[PDB]
Amino acid sequence: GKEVALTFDDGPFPIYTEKYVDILKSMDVKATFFVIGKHAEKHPELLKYIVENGNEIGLHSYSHFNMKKLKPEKMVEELYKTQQIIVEATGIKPTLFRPPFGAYNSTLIEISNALGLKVVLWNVDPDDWRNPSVESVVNRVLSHTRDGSIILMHEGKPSTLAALPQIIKKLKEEGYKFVTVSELLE
């Protein structure tokens, strides 16, 4: 059968992380959260909340700057610092890294791999950052989702929180199983 990975970038966020997690848990569905280190270290209890509910945490860098032009040692500092915040909060080491803006080069791939991280982007983008209506977010996801889809969404967004129940309902009716990015890639 068909699998899809729902993903949320840029958290955690007071109020919203807990709300996203509760919706997923209420629907028997798991997702992948790509957290910014500066946010993660302010809110360790929210990291534990993501993982206690069966969700995966990935890195989204410490600072959330475009990493395209960083020196190798700064790429290391950005990833290693975030990996350490996450494992100190959850006891679970992340294995995935989504670069800010999806910007990368071969060196960032090599540094990520040397830290035991896979670089992941996405293949379905309903542009939920520059807030669309909840109906147009739903329709972009349901019109583009295929077996192996990795859906880019953003934490801390009421319009995204609003769209989740309809996305989960309709994809479940189309026979999709919801998996983590790690499970999807195997």
Provide the strand spans (E) within the chain: 2-9, 32-35, 56-59, 96-97, 118-119, 149-154, 176-178
Q: Which of 39, 43, 60, 154 is catalytic?
A: 154
Q: Rule CB under 5 A: say whether 128 interacts with Ni ion.
A: no
Q: 8 or 49: whose CB is closer to Ni ion?
A: 8
* The only residue of 5, 6, 7, 10 in contact with Ni ion, by rule CB under 5 A: 10
Q: How far apart (Å, rounded) are the C-alpha atoms in residues 161 and 19?
A: 8
Q: What is the closest distance, in whole angstroms, from the C-beta atom of residue 101 to Ni ion in the complex?
A: 7
Q: Decide whether 63 or 139 has the Cβ nearer to Ni ion.
A: 63
Least distance from C-beta 163 to Ni ion, angstroms? 18
| Residue 9 annotated among the catalytic residues of the structure | yes
| Amino acid symbol at 31 | A
As given in the structure block, the two tokens for residue 105 are 């080069």
Q: Which amino acid would we find at residue 130?
A: R
Concatenated DSSP letters for 148-178? Answer: TEEEEEESS-HHHHHHHHHHHHHHHHTTEEE
Out of 9, 41, 56, 128, which residue is the one contacting Ni ion (CB under 5 A)? 9
Closest separation in Å from C-beta 60 to Ni ion: 6
Binding site residues, Ni ion, CB under 5 A: 9-10
Catalytic residue annotation: 9, 154
